[PDB]
């Protein structure tokens, strides 16, 4: 339970100067917070539970360390651990008035300090002195003779799940704090809790899962909003740090610690993200811790072990924190970009990106833009579209094995009809792996996609071979003309091939060729482009 | 081998013999994608299977929507370089898509270009101010109710589209062609969806519609669609049918959006048509009251008239301001209520919005007024060099980004209209704006400009001057170090407005002297209480006494601290002259002069500055 | 100036004249919404619970919940034989809204709203006292009850901060204004309402509310207004007891003023009207005495010196 | 640097000058073909006064080279190009410029 003042009694936030040992009064935020709590322990272990009476000798407890209150010679009044917390020290009784001024009761005994109205003066029974406090937001108290009157101190209950949050606290920092402790022992010392520690993950994971959507509304939103509390009753207590910093000592390896450990460590390292993750789901003050602290998550987002777990991680600090899409720059985007580049289209990558390039409602322009300048451009890397004319190829109804030539008078072309310049190719291919499906044939598909395929014409006439475009010159240096004539020529076992456009060379050509394959004609074509064949109408001889 | 699409449609061979004369028809084209790092195309159709790059894609179309990003445009001309003009027509037009991206590329459709000019155009669309030109005076309430008239007018800036030119501001598209497209599109949907046949087109309806009517709806909303094709609109929907149709809880959210802008074009309308009548009555009675600041409440008393023969005038109008989509919309919304249990909060939020502006469109009209504004038919080009600038700054509301607000709170500052006509200024809510951008900046100089511009929207009325004077506790609690001269611009005339504020702003104001024991800022704060306090002429005594309490404890030999500033930066001694100063400005309240008295306690500080010539 | 003019004309004609009684629309729209897995009015309320139920810090102000929370507020011997079929007329409109969840709906609202005193927490306070109105035991049964089955522990953290602010009235802003208590109204009768038909058990909730993690007192905190209200009363007479002759303003104000504090002292009597004998414990031995007393000595001069001219005797009566 | 090369005959006679207006369809691929722009996608032909350096200094003075009605190959340097800039969300830096133009009209 907290000891509201009229403001509430507390100690130092975590991580503290101080070794979170000196108490003090504190109003704002920590009302809230776990380390405003205080277990109430009567010394007795039986009937401990019994309505607390006036006057009753009882050490109070600070739940988050799990340190008992004391009077101290050696720091003066003083939160201290158990080990040192011999009874004489420590004892403490609730009382109506500041005069001065027995017999126990095994039962429940007597109802008498209500919460909240039942004003309590603190005194400790070793000395008789009282909890007054000295007279920034730190109200210092410590133990004195007297004590002016306002130094009252009415209760007030801790809720049930918060209180379990806050012994959860002290479990949790128990088990990590020595886990990292053992880290470090073999960190100097090339060759630990560890199920113990891993249980404790999962828990807590499962601690923090977010409510369900099948949920109705209500219920959703109150199991949100008690998320959203435990969560920053992680926050307070240094939980995040405490992640990692155990996030911190186990990146240094991808593995000193026995193998009998080092084949859970990459449960336990990735489960350690998905239980940060949980932390920075939904509040936004955790993500404001991590705004800056995003370069680690990005070198960690370049891990590749754990992989994916600080992605999402990454991701629950940019859906909810417009600091964090602030503080980004170029070298962290194009990590992300280059872990798009390293994992392949995962989408959630994609997802992570336009969470950067918008933050609920404002826009982060310089974002956007380098969001751009580090993808769009290269195009290389994801799905660039187009929309592509159709090529179909048609053939005369025989092949080829001696020597052979065929004419293909142009009829009808028409250059840029649609978008693209209409498709042309002409020359021969085997049998044996040409297969012009219409529909998409690599690049963008068409004749002269294959090594199987020998063409010729489109486009400054000249040639196609494995995809590549080679411009082999020619005396009229044109395309196909409505009026033009193709010639194609080609001989058994030699390899050669020649063209000629309107009965006149267009030079040598490709050579090597396999015979595996039967060679025929092929004229491919697009639009409403036609053509006459020639297998010898021949207009050249 | 690899399963794939047999192409929905494909050529036409048109071979014979002789020469064998092979031939074709017509044009048929893939929307293919490619995959550069297999350096494999595909036509997008087939990717309606291999559907984890169906997510992939239509992430990248997210991405795409989002790197637009709202209010952006240099970016949107690179997507104009990948996701190319053609292809998202061509993704419109075909009715095979896979829905997600179906939707998502007329969520680019939108984006790309319709997006930020709808921005531009959706908050003017809220404003009212109509100029008085012979156009709007025959428009009438009632035609000679229906919505989409030709002769909305007001002023509503136009549409800027940069053509996406690519050698060397917002991309371009054929606004009327793709206005037919989007139309036939809502044809083809009603007419298919009416025979119930169930391709259904994005395999769902939701993707059948939502997209479409969305497009259509900013579409709408922009303006585009010239009487006739609104009637298109309209026919579909009520007809008087879309609107009757079976629905998913999610298209009844775009029929929401869509009848939302047939009822505020309808405000439009009304509110236009009640203006012509100021013109078409006010020109009326100022002959009446030429036949024989207080002007306006003499009008007032042409006001009392309901409880001089034109009153009967005003006696029909009013009952013209009484007012079928009325029957409709609220049939409909009740109807969607009543049968359905609608879930999803939105398409409900949008419901009884719609229902609301059903059973009270002249309280509708009666918000709708303020924002309203005549306009003389000379000066509006102005204004329309105005209300452009702060679509910028109204750009700039949701986000370098400081020269485009800098360049445009001095062209307002240049213009006629900002002289002529405060009261439209203020009706806009644009200081509002302003001050708001001015804080999403402090948490530079660009602060600065902005402050010139509240400064001065201090100086051109005192009436405004109260409009900035309702923000100052957020404008001192914004001011951790220059807004607070603004607010000493908002104190620094009325002395109505002086006795207007509150305690707790110069509280604030003292406690930020508190918190400078350590300088300028203190100054600052004293010249913002200087102002707080001296008024024109003998200082106010109801703020200066408070004033002085409060600064019995927080701004804190001090006479010594002058001559050791002297010895030398020299801005406490300004700090010191400042106090001394506001301590000047201070004079039941006898008890107070001993209070400064007991800080004559100065004389030798006359010498010393004297001698520090 | 034809421009100023006209622009003036509409700042005229919307001065007047607009303000028609339209607003009896607002009633019939709520039977259009009664009209029939629930029905479109149930729907709009338990919409409006959707949002009272988020979480967002501070609730931003829905123009559509003021505007439709406002319109459930307007939506609610023959003389004595009219009376029981007006009365029943207003428990039939009451129910009408009741069975559709709205009280727990403003219920939520004002839990939600908490400590700010927005004009939207005003309309929940219309709406709420337009349900409870006259009084009605099943509105504040399930009110009750939806207190008791969901310990919001918030609700009156809400009305305990928004109290602490509320409305008071002030020496020197009047001696400023020289050259709002509407929501208290609202509010104290809300609270009056709340407890209503003598609801021994809702008295001694608000006295406490057991089942919360945090009991608060309304009483002690009502009590607490009604203490600084007769201090600033007090003043307010020291500001006038020299003056005999009192301005319109003081005479206006103050009145006001009247109101309020007539509002509380009817809370505060609402809230022992029963005896519930825990409640006359608490506010017992509450700073009430204080305040009566001060009360008396406002009462006792002003309730001379009023009486010495007949202008003041209307200010005096109240 | 640039190096216009002759796709299909046009007149061979009206060669762009200093104040035409030169009225062109085009298509824009980089070294890798990757299309990056395309004029008859948008079906409207492009209008750029020569020699007014509204366009890139390649497509400047390598169009000259072109002819009425010509179709030409225009494998703009980088240079004079968008240069080591790149043109930014579209062309990377030092992207060597591959043109399909078509030079309908001078006007």
Redesign the interface.
């Given at each position: 339970l907290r000891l509201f003042h009229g403001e509430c009694l507390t100690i130092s936030a975590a991580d503290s100067d101080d070794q979170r040992r000196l108490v003090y009064y504190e109003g704002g935020a920590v009302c809230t917070h776990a380390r405003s709590l205080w277990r109430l322990e009567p010394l007795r272990i039986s009937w401990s539970g019994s309505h607390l009476r006036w006057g009753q000798p009882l050490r109070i407890r600070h739940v988050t360390t799990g340190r008992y209150l004391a009077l101290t010679e050696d720091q003066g009044l003083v939160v201290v651990d158990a080990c040192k917390a011999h009874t004489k020290a420590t004892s403490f009784c609730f009382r109506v008035s500041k005069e001065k001024l027995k017999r126990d009761v095994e039962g429940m005994g007597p109802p008498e300090i209500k919460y909240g109205e039942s004003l309590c003066f603190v005194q400790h029974v070793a000395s008789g002195l009282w909890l007054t406090y000295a007279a920034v937001l730190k109200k210092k108290a410590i133990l004195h003779q007297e004590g002016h009157m306002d130094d009252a101190l009415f209760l007030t209950r801790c809720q049930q799940e918060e209180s379990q949050a806050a012994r959860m606290i002290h479990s949790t920092a128990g088990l990590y704090n020595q886990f990292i402790k053992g880290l470090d022992s073999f960190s100097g010392k090339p060759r630990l809790p560890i199920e113990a520690v891993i249980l404790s993950l999962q828990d807590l994971i499962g601690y923090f899962e977010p409510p369900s959507e099948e949920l109705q509304h209500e219920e959703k939103q109150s199991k949100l909003r008690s998320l959203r509390n435990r969560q920053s009753l992680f926050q307070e207590e240094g939980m995040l740090s405490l992640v990692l910093n155990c996030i911190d000592r186990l990146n240094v390896y991808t593995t000193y610690a026995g193998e009998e450990a080092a084949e859970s460590w990459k449960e336990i390292v990735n489960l350690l993200y998905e239980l940060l993750a949980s932390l920075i789901r939904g509040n936004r003050a955790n993500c404001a811790l991590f705004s800056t602290n995003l370069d680690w998550v990005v070198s960690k987002l370049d891990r590749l072990e754990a992989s994916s777990g600080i992605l999402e991680v990454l991701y629950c600090v940019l859906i909810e924190s417009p600091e964090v899409l602030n503080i980004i720059q170029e070298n962290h985007i194009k990590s992300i970009i280059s872990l798009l580049d390293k994992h392949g289209r995962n989408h959630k990558v994609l997802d992570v990106l336009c969470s950067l390039c918008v933050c609920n409602g404002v826009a982060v322009r310089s974002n956007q833009?380098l969001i751009?300048?580090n993808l769009?451009?290269?195009?290389?890397l994801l799905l660039?579209t187009?929309?592509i004319n159709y090529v179909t190829s048609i053939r005369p109804n025989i092949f080829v094995g001696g020597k052979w030539y065929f004419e293909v008078m142009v009829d009808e072309v028409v250059?840029?009809l649609?978008?693209?310049?209409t498709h042309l190719r002409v020359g021969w291919a085997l049998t044996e792996g040409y297969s012009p499906y219409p529909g998409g044939g690599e690049?963008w598909g068409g004749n002269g996609v294959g090594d199987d395929l020998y063409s010729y014409g489109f486009?400054?006439l000249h040639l196609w071979t494995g995809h590549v475009a080679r411009?082999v010159t020619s005396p009229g240096?044109?395309?196909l003309a409505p009026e033009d004539v193709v010639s194609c020529c080609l001989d058994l076992s030699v390899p050669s091939i020649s063209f000629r456009i309107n009965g006149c060379p267009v030079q040598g050509v490709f050579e090597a060729f396999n015979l595996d394959g039967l060679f025929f004609p092929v004229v491919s074509f697009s639009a409403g482009v036609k053509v006459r064949f020639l297998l010898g109408e021949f207009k050249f001889l | 081998r690899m399963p794939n699409h047999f192409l929905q449609v494909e050529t036409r061979r048109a071979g014979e013999r002789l020469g064998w004369a092979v031939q074709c028809q017509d044009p048929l084209t893939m929307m293919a994608l490619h995959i550069?790092e297999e350096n494999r195309c595909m036509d997008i159709l087939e990717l309606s299977e291999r559907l984890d790059l169906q997510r992939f894609h239509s992430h990248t179309l997210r991405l795409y929507r989002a790197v637009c990003a709202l209010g952006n445009n240099?970016?949107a001309?690179?997507?104009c370089?990948?996701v190319?003009?053609?292809?998202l027509l061509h993704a419109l037009e075909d009715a095979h898509l896979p829905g997600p991206l179906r939707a998502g590329y007329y969520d680019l459709l939108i984006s790309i270009h319709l997006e930020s000019a709808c921005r531009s155009r959706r908050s003017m669309l809220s404003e009212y101010i109509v100029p008085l030109t012979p156009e709007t005076r025959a428009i009438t309430l009632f035609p000679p109710g229906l919505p989409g008239v030709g002769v909305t007018t007001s002023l509503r800036p136009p549409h800027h589209f940069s053509?996406?030119?690519?050698?060397?501001l917002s991309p371009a598209i054929?606004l009327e062609a793709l206005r037919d497209k989007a139309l036939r599109m809502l044809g083809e949907a009603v007419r298919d969806g009416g025979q119930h046949a169930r391709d259904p087109v994005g395999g769902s309806v939701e993707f059948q519609f939502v997209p479409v009517l969305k497009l259509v709806s900013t579409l709408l909303v922009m303006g585009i669609f010239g009487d006739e094709d609104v009637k298109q609109i309209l026919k579909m929907i009520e007809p008087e049918g879309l609107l009757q149709m079976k629905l998913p809880e999610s298209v009844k959210l775009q029929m929401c959006n869509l009848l939302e802008y047939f009822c505020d074009q309808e405000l439009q309308h009304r509110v236009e048509s009640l203006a012509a009548f100021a013109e078409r009555y006010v020109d009326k009675l100022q002959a009446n009251q030429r036949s024989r600041d207080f002007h306006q409440d003499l009008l007032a008393h042409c006001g009392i008239q309901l409880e001089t023969s034109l009153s009967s005038r005003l006696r029909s109008l009013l009952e013209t301001v009484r007012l079928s989509l009325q029957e409709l919309v609220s049939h409909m919304v009740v109807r969607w209520a009543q049968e359905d249990y609608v879930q999803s909060p939105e398409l409900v939020r949008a419901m009884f919005s719609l229902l609301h502006r059903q059973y009270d469109g002249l309280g509708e009209l009666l918000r709708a007024l303020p924002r309203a504004y005549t306009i003389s038919p000379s000066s509006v080009e102005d204004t329309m060099s105005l209300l452009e600038c702060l679509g910028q700054i109204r750009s700039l509301l949701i986000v370098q980004e400081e020269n485009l607000m800098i360049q445009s709170i001095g062209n307002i500052m240049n213009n006629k209209v900002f002289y002529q006509h405060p009261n439209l200024m203020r009706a806009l809510g644009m200081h509002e704006t302003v001050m708001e951008v001015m804080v999403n900046v402090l948490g530079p100089k660009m602060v600065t400009s902005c402050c010139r511009f509240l400064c001065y929207f201090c100086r051109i009325s005192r009436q405004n001057q109260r409009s900035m004077f309702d923000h100052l506790s957020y404008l001192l609690e914004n001011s951790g170090i220059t807004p607070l001269d603004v607010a000493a611009a908002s104190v620094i005339d009325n002395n109505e407005l002086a006795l207007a504020l509150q305690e707790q702003d110069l509280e604030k104001v003292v406690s930020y002297l508190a918190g400078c024991g350590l300088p300028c800022g203190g100054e600052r704060y004293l010249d913002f209480l200087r102002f707080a306090v001296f008024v024109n002429g003998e200082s106010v005594e109801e703020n200066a006494n408070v004033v002085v309490r409060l600064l019995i404890r927080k701004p804190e030999g001090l006479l010594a601290a002058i001559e050791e500033a002297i010895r030398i930066g020299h801005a406490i001694m300004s700090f010191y002259a400042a106090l001394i100063d506001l301590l000047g400005r201070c004079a039941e309240a006898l008890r107070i002069r001993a209070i400064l008295r007991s800080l004559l306690d100065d004389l030798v500080g006359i010498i010393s500055l004297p001698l520090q010539i | 100036p034809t421009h100023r003019a006209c622009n003036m004309f509409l700042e005229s004609y919307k001065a007047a004249w607009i303000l028609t009684e339209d607003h009896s629309f607002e009633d019939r729209m709520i039977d259009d919404l009664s009209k029939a897995k629930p029905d479109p009015l149930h729907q709009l309320v338990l919409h409006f619970s959707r949002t009272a139920l988020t979480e967002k810090s501070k609730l931003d102000e829905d123009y559509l919940y003021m505007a439709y929370a406002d319109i459930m507020a307007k939506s609610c011997e023959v003389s004595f034989e009219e009376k029981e079929m007006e009365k029943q007329r207003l428990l039939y409109q009451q129910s009408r809204l009741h069975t559709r969840g709205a009280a727990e709906m403003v219920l939520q609202m004002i839990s939600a709203c908490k400590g700010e005193t927005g004009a939207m927490v005003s309309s929940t306070l219309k709406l709420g006292i337009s349900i409870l109105n006259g009084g009605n035991a099943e509105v504040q049964q399930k009110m009750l009850d939806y207190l008791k089955d969901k310990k919001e522990v918030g609700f009156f953290q809400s009305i305990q901060a928004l109290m602490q602010t509320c409305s008071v009235l002030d020496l020197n802003a009047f001696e400023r204004q020289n050259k709002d208590d509407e929501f208290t109204q609202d509010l104290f009768r809300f609270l009056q309402l709340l407890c209503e038909g003598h609801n021994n058990d809702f008295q001694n909730y608000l006295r406490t509310q057991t089942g919360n993690t945090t009991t608060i007192n309304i009483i002690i905190c009502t009590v607490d207004y009604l203490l600084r209200l007769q201090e600033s009363i007090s003043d307010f007479y020291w500001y006038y007891s020299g003056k005999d002759v009192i301005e319109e303003q003081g005479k206006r104000n103050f009145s006001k003023a009247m109101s309020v504090a007539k509002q509380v002292f009817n809370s505060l009597t609402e809230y022992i009207q029963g005896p519930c004998t825990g409640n006359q414990q608490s506010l017992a031995h509450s700073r009430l005495w204080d305040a009566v007393v001060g009360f008396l000595h406002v009462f006792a001069h002003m309730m001379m010196k009023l009486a010495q001219d007949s202008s003041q005797i209307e200010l005096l009566k109240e | 640097g640039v190096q216009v090369?002759?796709?299909?005959?046009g007149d061979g006679r009206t060669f762009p000058k200093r104040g035409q207006t030169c009225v062109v369809?085009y298509?824009?691929m980089?070294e890798?073909?990757?299309?990056?722009?395309?004029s008859?996608?948008?079906?409207?032909p492009?209008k750029?006064m020569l020699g007014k350096q509204?366009?890139?200094r390649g497509?400047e003075e390598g169009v000259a080279q072109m002819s009425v009605g010509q179709?030409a190959?225009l494998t703009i340097s980088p240079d004079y190009a968008?240069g080591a800039t790149?043109?930014?969300?579209?062309?990377?830096p030092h992207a060597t410029l591959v043109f399909?133009v078509?030079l309908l009209k001078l006007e």
């Open positions: 833009d751009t300048e769009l451009p290269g195009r290389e660039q187009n929309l250059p840029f649609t978008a693209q310049a690049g486009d400054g411009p240096q044109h395309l | 550069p240099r970016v001309h690179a997507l370089s990948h190319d003009q053609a292809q053509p996406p030119c690519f050698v060397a054929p | - | 090369e002759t796709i299909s005959p369809h298509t824009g980089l890798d073909g990757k299309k990056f722009d395309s008859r996608d948008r079906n409207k492009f750029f509204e366009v890139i497509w179709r190959k968008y790149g043109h930014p969300g579209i062309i990377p399909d078509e």
